[PDB]
Symmetry: D2
């Protein structure tokens, strides 16, 4: 099947940042024709640790900025919702509605996303076991979702640390398409945190094990990002990472197990 690459700046810092990233993603979409690209960016960081951190410019502004990206580059769009009422307005531009990791068990939010008729991607909560995602997919199907994805983004491992149990990819694959969050899985919750040096190796692991797509937050200058400055991938490195995982995926694919 067509490999999915979900990527974009963590937060919609501005409509300019988006178009700048969208341009590069469009270029890669033209090169990697065997890949389905989806532009990602949050109109709001509703779960920052500190009340003083950047959240965003609002739903209205965010949706409008995203529609511009889709309009200008013809790229599919995905963004996350935080409360039920947001599903409807977001569904107007988002091809895939994302459910935040902490909210992966909030029934009404999942139901709100599902009835829009859009695809739904649920980030697996850091407190959730792989096999417990079966009920998550069941809620979505109950709610009308026909295209469902489960995203691996790490599991709580002691304090301020996340480990990736790759056994989750084949387990979750039993009931939904699986995406690997290459940048969220290396973050250190409330650490400062994040270790950028592990993004690449862990993503190679993901494609070797086998998944249906990767998720990466990328920014022109991660150092200046308003969110996830420690984990966002420098935009100039995106192409190389993608070529690399496509190569590893190809050679490893004949060995992927049959669920």
């Amino acid at each position: 099947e067509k490999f999915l690459v979900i990527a974009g700046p963590c937060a919609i810092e501005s409509e300019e940042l988006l178009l700048k990233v969208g341009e590069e993603i469009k270029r890669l979409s033209e090169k990697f024709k065997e890949v389905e690209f989806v532009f990602k960016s949050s109109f709001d960081k509703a779960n920052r640790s500190s009340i003083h951190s950047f959240r965003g410019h609002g739903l209205e502004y965010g949706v409008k900025a995203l529609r511009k990206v889709k309009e200008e580059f013809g790229l599919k769009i995905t963004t996350d919702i935080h409360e039920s009422w947001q599903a409807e307005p977001v569904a107007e531009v988002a091809d895939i509605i994302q459910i935040p990791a902490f909210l992966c068990r909030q029934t009404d939010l999942l139901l709100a996303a599902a009835k829009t008729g859009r695809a739904v991607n649920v980030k697996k909560g850091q407190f959730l076991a792989p096999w417990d995602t079966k009920n998550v997919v069941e809620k979505l199907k109950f709610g009308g979702a026909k295209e469902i994805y489960l995203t691996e983004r790490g599991t709580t491992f002691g304090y301020n640390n996340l480990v990736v149990d790759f056994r989750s990819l084949p387990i979750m694959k039993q009931w939904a398409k699986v995406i690997y969050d290459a940048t969220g899985s290396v973050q250190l919750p409330g650490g400062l945190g994040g270790m950028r040096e592990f993004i690449f190796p862990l993503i190679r692991a993901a494609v070797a094990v086998g998944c249906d797509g990767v998720f990466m937050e990328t920014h022109p200058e991660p150092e200046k990002a308003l969110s996830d400055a420690s984990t966002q991938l420098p935009l100039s490195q995106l192409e190389g990472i993608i070529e690399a995982i496509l190569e590893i995926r190809e050679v490893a694919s004949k060995y992927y197990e049959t669920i």
Copy 2:
């Protein structure tokens, strides 16, 4: 004074609430030094299965709770799941409770603080003790003056929660600490560990305990495996007050 927050997990009916409320009222009269707070949810908004009991709704719930406060003069507390629920809930709730999974949702916290009520945040199973400092700051920023942090266990491998009692003294630096005696032994539980760990909580030192109690836990529509049998509540309360009395002498300064 020492806080004791108790009640059935879910508002299965105002009938059940009234029965439990009667017993809590009784204990309330028997333990005058303890501040009792009746607790119950009008909706289990985070059940694993779409086919599980959620409740009878916010309206039916607030009504049932209203009847408990009016018929027994007991303070009330319930949890909210989305921002718009803060205001209507604040009508009856003296303490607005924030679900563990939602302890980082800024808008939910701000909405609860805005109501002027007291706010009790259940500590996420993914959160480190010291990271609750920022949770409190959000509430203070939002106008909350009576803030509580409730220890309910931490993710330990899959389908298991461990109680790191080091959290109590750490969280006490910036907020009053409550120990969730029934939520801490559940397996994302063993009722046999409820009393032992509640004893540990008061020996370590906390500002209150939190317990889900039901006449027939096995028949409860929620947390049937961890809810405390109503008949056992008095005995446990007496026990923890006695332990607290002796142990409080050694609680570390702030």
Copy 3:
């Protein structure tokens, strides 16, 4: 039953340090007559992280120093072994043979300790689940051990950290007397580590839950210790801690569950 308080300097830095601690332990044994004191000290730290750290002055010297303590103060003695051949010579002075946490599954070591006829105290490995200690006790009984103790000293929780799951006390109590290691449970493995501020609260928790004794490494000046300098309890604080746990134990005891 008579509460057990196992205490002493982590390592036998010298025979003087031992007599100095032994004197204080003897004084407390005279005061707390409802307590059975056992003087503890390792003749060798065989598992230091660094090859450059203090290990000890050898078995010969250690045993001789311990025999002096027992001889001078009439105090029971306990020390740990690291290999099978050490059981016999150590058994000549030690009333209780201790098995290190990392070695709690080494069959021959456990068997070596058991055949001496001495009591055996096994530190629960940081990798072991509470219920898995049942087989540990079975090995010891198979080997002839008649007086067996299981010591809770924490469990691996993420990297360089240990958490105490107090549910282990009643679980392990099903097949052996249980001891709580108040100083080992707060150490941060390979941290530098240890957090002394948590020793007291966690020990209050232990007696409230209910155990058959406590284990504490105490040194006149923890800051100058050759081992566990970050976790050893200042000797001057020992009396107060003991009085405190006896008080909490008493008031909580009527509520201890029946296994």
Copy 4:
């Protein structure tokens, strides 16, 4: 060259060793770029139950292994459990293996290094990746020149091990890294996860893989739930060499 350490968990008999050794010899001739090392224990010294199979002893074991090296010209490796065993084992063993639980026992490490042989330390389930640096230092201090660190999983809650692949690049800073493909999926296991994770190990980058293989794992006297069926070894080796070939291009510098 890339290392492939394989063989039956326990030396159930030199008969079994010879059969497995024959297949490993065959692969050895088929994969000339890979350095194969025959592995097997003469004693399961850390079994949970006193009533489980331990082995036939060090003498019978060293003899059986000697026969494999002489009959197939394959390098040998086995694990020691106490210091005195280092010397006699070094007679046959090209690589002395240090059990995971014993990775911190200084004397055991020094005794293995003293023999002049190569030393492979299984990383304790309680050890952080960066703390293996000191393990290597001990071996260097002891005279070891060929040092290996084997990733075999980390304690994750109770009765479970997780493989944190971040360890591979971290440990590679001070020693060659081997991935234990069968020990990492055992539950203190699911064979279905052996191949997926071994693929991940080579995509990330390691200097070799470690696998316990047996003609009939289900009948094996040790690790019957995690041992790889002998017939599947060739296929997995071919697969990991192909993945390595493509992925090695991206392994990070040191």
